[PDB]
Ligand binder design. Structure first.
Ligand SMILES: Cc1ncc(Cc2c([C@H](C)O)sc(CCOP(=O)(O)OP(=O)(O)O)c2C)c(N)n1
Ligand SMILES: Cc1ncc(Cc2c([C@H](C)O)sc(CCOP(=O)(O)OP(=O)(O)O)c2C)c(N)n1
Ligand SMILES: Cc1ncc(Cc2c([C@H](C)O)sc(CCOP(=O)(O)OP(=O)(O)O)c2C)c(N)n1
Ligand SMILES: [Cl-]
Ligand SMILES: [Cl-]
Ligand SMILES: [Cl-]
Ligand SMILES: [Mg+2]
Ligand SMILES: [Mg+2]
Ligand SMILES: [Mg+2]
Lengths: 535, 538, 535, 141
């Protein structure tokens, strides 16, 4: 029976494709050359290379988020892998399953004690599972275990492949090992959660990151309708249940958000955090701001309330168990008025402010343009994008690490099947990774990038205006665009901005860089409310 | 709790660094690090230089440390900022460069964002790539901790990690004292010195290798004296390149494995008395590999220990070992100087033919032979480094063992920031430039004007040499010279040898702005050293 | 300030003594010689050597159990350490903190790939914390962390010491790092537990192993009085609260125990398992036999009930929190009749049966002999010892591994400060480790050992009587006693048995071996009830 | 010992390599000039050939070497101690070796010897046997 076998590298690539992976981003090196050869020759997964490892990690993260599937980031041993630590930490922080595949010395090549392994130890700190595939007999089961963990916890995993093992013959990779659930514990959990929601004077259902990652939108829309309580999304749950019978009242983003939404969440005595990342992070739900004696935290395959925890409870299982205990309903709240986005750009000779950029994007949408998914870097560009009409928003809202923007827009467009991506990024972040746009030609994509150039690390000036080190030079980004294959244009007035955005949407084939000059001291409304809130 | 010293913790640290030789602090701020950067900017204890991306902060600090054989200083913010410098720090660890990493962190009374699950993830990651760490969360203990950690960086010439909660930046502390003393076994030192001399005297073909620690610890004069008295052939490792060049018994050449001179390689690998004085031992690129030499007949002095005759003597500082050997050797007037070892390529044919790496080497060397004082060279990893091996320099700084890309431009920048006006020549390939060459946009604010020769073969060429069949090593056309103006520098794309010659002369005659020479090179054309490296792998 | 330092090995020994360790058992080897030199020269802890590593592990386990403190087992790298794996697994299984210290190659001696480290990996599977002390700067903190874990979870830990590190100078070892507790979670836990005990129709408080290990007898006696519910002990809680205002009604040992006690436990709808090991083991409380919807399991620093768990709740903290919520009481149940032990040995010419051995021991006690602590091996000797009056019973009641008996009696007597120990062991188990008695002379002890010789692996015959392999030869153990320094006597009749036991108690200075011949097919009453119960 | 450790062409045919008791140690030989055939692989000239069974390697070498009548037999290598002085002096390990060897020289067919770890093994090395079984590398008692 069966008796077939293939190269270890091929078995791994097929296992990834079997699980929904859509591409492999990476930068090779001597130790990883053999693995990249197999990837290129077999063509199991499209192979996209980038310039610098941070972008490889950010692009793989973005692709994972775009399709709620596994992302794949391939690097070489040593500097290549260490150079992707931050991007992988960001994916871990925001629950994105990036599969890190690093080449490594052959099993016979002994060691290389320059750092005396250190790389494996470092990656153990930022992934949920790891495996060094140095035994062909056990490789298939180890691949299934590690990929299975990535899918079960929606976080990065690490696979190290000695180069002499790339071509080792192995059996095909089977299904993820099962993480069975205790039916009795699950029943008890669902019973307590439901009882808690029914006894609360003000229950609130928060739809969060895991709902999207695990593709539970349909099931949760049904749960929300039956539960009958107010629905609110977290920053990473933005957009969920938009088409549901009972869409979210809004999104909680902390102090800078709608005061009515903030109060509803923070004063709830039955706060059901369905799949939420909790942290004292800027836009996240913080344990310090909610009632811990009444919160129900369903996250990381556990459910916590009243300071006690039900272990090994997958979110999907919890949702189904609650559905089994709730009668159907025909209730709806879709008769309400939609959200009011800032519109009406005054295309005149006045200088540009972040909100003008928001109005420019929103007007095209109102005029008939189908919204584009937006990839945002960290900075006022993100605070501005929150007031933009989108077809999804991808940003390091909790991790807050810079450099994600451009590479994410690139990674997303690589797997969007034709959908164009809009990227917003500040000058500081662009100096870090905006250069990756030079790869658009080879990748066959043409994202639109609005660069907020205030020749400043403005979020830092805002918190400490007396410092001079936040004053950056004026880099002529638009002028540098042609050198890396795109069409760039520097705009200084709202009129030029309006014109430049229309031109970008009308021009395909090359990335379009709109360099918007913004004076220092000028912020988006959301960042302003955020700063005032801190004071 | 201390009070009254009128000395902020951050200030005490900056002064402790300056006391030990630090010449600047490179960094990129963040909310958690703002208070620390404020103290740095306002006090000006150390010149503060910001860069665009954290990898450059780490590379520049490493380069500054290597340039002056002192401590380098790299400041970042908590989380993303710090994690983004892990690679540059690992590279400094790998090549024995004491980069002092200073990361901002949440205040001691504000907890943190447990997004990753001191036992915090960041601290645990940095402990793997540094020789000592400290979280300065106690003002009463901070002075001693700083001395211990900075002392560790100086004792082993490796990066260290300091994490400062933002509410501790301004906490009053007492002044930082001297580095605590590290153990020294004087009896072991004596026995070791005797055994080493006996082994070198009985060897049929002893060889003295002058390595990285000799440079890091400023022992060139003592080692020159030792080399003359010891009376055995002298060779340097890549990291020891240039040492003893003016001594009575200068190195016969530099050992770098199969890529180097066959005679030098033979001498080292067939030695039955190989004295590795301060050498990194590893199977990586140009390092002396345990797999190529006979460890049984090797005397390895490194990391404050000495290994020979199967055993190891602990607690023996390299400076102490050298002094002990000198005390056992009578003076000598022995001299083995002679006409230049390893001929540098010269005579560039400034014509219409395309450019090859060796032509770039000849262009640089011809200027030097015509009277130009050589510049120190910062090289990235790639054929640019293999080409630089054949360039006359005033020092060469490169990831010769770690082989991580991106070091080049930022190292040139870091080095020129502390060179007191001495211009730095950076060589870098197109793949590496796409990673960190953009840092040149900071030259104007930093007040520097490096000359950068970018080897543009539209290819990850070193990878092509290893696996020519693959298509992914074919890179696109990036017009780097055309992007120079946007970053405040002068760029020119050259295709012929005549254009190269003219461009190099113009770059040298033009200070005040960085000069970018984008040399177009066809794929498949390699420097002689890389070609030998490739043939040696066959 | 301070600025003092000492050899790493000395710092470790003092840290152990600081935590109550009373001795160090071990067998040296080339890699461990330097460490044993420091132990012998410093005399910080008495150094006792044994013949074979299993005994080193069993003796250290017994010493830990005897004084509810840390046990110390020192071995050499390789065969020495691997030969102690079973004893360490047994200590882990029965919650005994044995500190395993293994010598190892120096940090410069590279490696020894005979098994390619493997030893470290194997010990990670049977200990709660490990550390290779290869860095003098961090050694003190690592020692405190590992010893702290042994004390916090009451399970074995592993310390590997490269021989060139034995004499490395280090700072003294400080206190165990704190494992702080969330006051709010603790309050919530105590509140729910108390509420559950009050709502149960039949609450039961089981006093178990952790109560003894953590020295909480006094605090639990107070809790038991205030809670006012029936008290029962588990096998490993045998003897606890004997002098308490409300002593246990008895001990639960499963099917072979008192039917009234068994029912009380198994039908309780408020079973408070205070520090219990749960398992389908012979004498243990099994999850399969109790009501999981009503059990409250306080164990391993957690509390579980209703399928949910309160994490990081130390047993001591839980007990104090419950005491704070309970009013004092003067209730007592000490007016009841004591336990009826089998007595009245017929000192005649009839052959010996296990129960005759029980009667012999019990009669001496009734006649005025202060009871001795009993160390029992696994076999009918244990089932027989359960009906003996003791000053404590030490046996592998849950782990059920053979060989523990004699070495445990030896380890216990080494730290009993003059108290004599009675050991019961079968012929099969004696053939394994009874030979360790040859060490009594050097150790300066003289335990009394009753060897049940039925020339058979009788517990196995009982479950499968048709097999011939359980028929063992007749080894003349009593005759071999003088060769290893003890006084041996083979007895065949109840009269000889009676006489031999009196003689043993009357003779000090040499171990006393009473070899009791018992015919095959003859079992203790407890083993008989156990066997019938299975059928 | 000299012959092995100074060899510039050491063919370890099926050898365990370890720094333990009697095993051939990587620290005593020159791995650069060593050909290590073991665990179905062969390592030489810095590289390793995978999937090469020892029996296959031997056959392949035989197919490349012509027959030979070469003979290097000679009088016994390593002299076994004999001549036990059966008197009133105490016993030393070498006396036990001589007692065993004398019986063999007097006509007793040698027995295979099983040795534990300790001087018993070091003594057995000088005993005439019909095979020796002992933990010579692992050294476990
Ligand atoms: C990798 C990295 N380094 C440093 C930071 C700190 C930081 C901010 C926080 C602390 O995360 S905000 C900011 C300035 C960003 O400048 P820009 O991209 O031009 O957008 P804007 O001008 O709107 O600020 C920095 C440097 C970061 N978030 N990530
Ligand atoms: C950070 C990092 N990533 C990947 C590598 C692998 C690598 C090389 C080895 C394995 O270190 S050589 C090379 C190509 C460099 O291209 P380029 O800069 O244009 O110079 P050249 O064309 O001469 O090769 C790569 C990607 C590396 N050394 N460092
Ligand atoms: C180390 C070890 N090996 C094997 C067993 C299996 C076993 C029993 C179970 C399965 O644990 S009971 C028993 C026979 C013991 O014979 P003995 O000591 O003379 O006492 P008795 O004759 O009363 O049986 C064995 C071998 C064990 N418990 N521990
Ligand atoms: Cl979330
Ligand atoms: Cl070196
Ligand atoms: Cl128990
Ligand atoms: Mg900006
Ligand atoms: Mg190139
Ligand atoms: Mg028996």
């Amino acid at each position: 029976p069966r008796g077939s076998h293939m190269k270890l590298a091929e078995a791994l690539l097929r296992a990834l494709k079997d699980r929904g992976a859509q591409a492999m981003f990476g930068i090779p090196g001597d130790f990883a050359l053999p693995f990249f050869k197999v990837a290129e020759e077999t063509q199991i997964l499209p192979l996209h290379t980038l310039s610098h490892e941070p972008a490889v990690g950010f692009a793989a993260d973005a692709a994972a988020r775009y399709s709620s599937t596994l992302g794949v980031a391939a690097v070489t041993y040593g500097a290549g892998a260490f150079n992707m630590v931050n991007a992988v930490a960001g994916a871990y922080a925001e629950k994105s399953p990036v599969v890190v595949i690093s080449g490594a010395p052959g099993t016979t090549e002994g060691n290389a004690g320059l750092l005396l392994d250190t790389q494996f130890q470092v990656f153990k700190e930022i992934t949920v599972a790891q495996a060094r595939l140095d035994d062909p007999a056990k490789a298939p089961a180890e691949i299934a275990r590690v990929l299975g963990a990535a899918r079960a916890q929606s976080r990065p995993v690490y696979l190290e492949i000695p180069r002499n093992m790339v071509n080792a013959e192995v059996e095909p990779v089977g299904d993820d090992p099962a993480w069975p659930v205790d039916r009795d514990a699950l029943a008890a959990c669902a019973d307590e959660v439901l009882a808690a929601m029914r006894s609360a004077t003000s229950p609130v259902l928060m739809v969060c990151v895991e709902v999207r990652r695990y593709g539970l939108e349909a099931k949760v829309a049904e749960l929300a309708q039956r539960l009958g309580v107010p629905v609110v999304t977290t920053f990473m749950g933005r957009g969920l249940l938009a088409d549901a019978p009972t869409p979210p009242l809004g999104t909680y983003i902390g102090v800078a958000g709608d005061a009515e939404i903030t109060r509803l969440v923070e004063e709830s005595d039955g706060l059901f955090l369905l799949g939420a990342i909790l942290s004292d992070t800027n836009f996240a739900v913080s344990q310090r701001k909610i009632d811990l004696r009444k919160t129900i935290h369903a996250f990381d395959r556990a459910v916590t309330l009243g300071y006690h925890t039900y272990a090994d409870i997958p979110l999907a299982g919890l949702v189904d168990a609650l559905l089994e205990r709730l009668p159907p309903s025909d209730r709806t709240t879709r008769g309400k008025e939609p959200h009011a986005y800032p519109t009406g750009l005054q295309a005149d000779g006045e200088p540009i402010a972040p909100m003008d950029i928001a109005r420019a994007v929103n007007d095209r949408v109102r005029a008939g343009q189908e919204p584009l998914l937006i990839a945002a870097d960290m900075g006022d560009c993100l605070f501005t994008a929150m007031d933009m009409i989108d077809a999804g928003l991808m940003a390091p809202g909790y991790y807050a690490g810079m450099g994600f923007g451009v590479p994410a827009g690139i990674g997303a467009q690589c797997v969007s099947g034709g959908k164009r991506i809009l990227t917003v990024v500040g000058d500081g972040a662009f100096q870090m990774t905006g250069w990756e746009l030079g790869n658009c030609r080879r990748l066959g994509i043409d994202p639109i990038v609005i660069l907020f150039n205030n020749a400043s690390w403005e979020m830092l000036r805002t918190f400490q205006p007396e410092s001079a080190f936040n004053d950056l030079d004026d880099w002529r980004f638009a002028d540098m665009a042609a050198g890396m294959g795109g069409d760039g244009v520097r705009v200084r007035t709202r009129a030029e901005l309006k014109a430049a955005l229309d031109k970008a949407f009308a021009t395909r084939g090359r990335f379009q860089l709109i360099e918007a000059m913004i004076p220092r001291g000028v912020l988006s409304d959301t960042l302003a409310r955020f700063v005032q809130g801190q004071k």
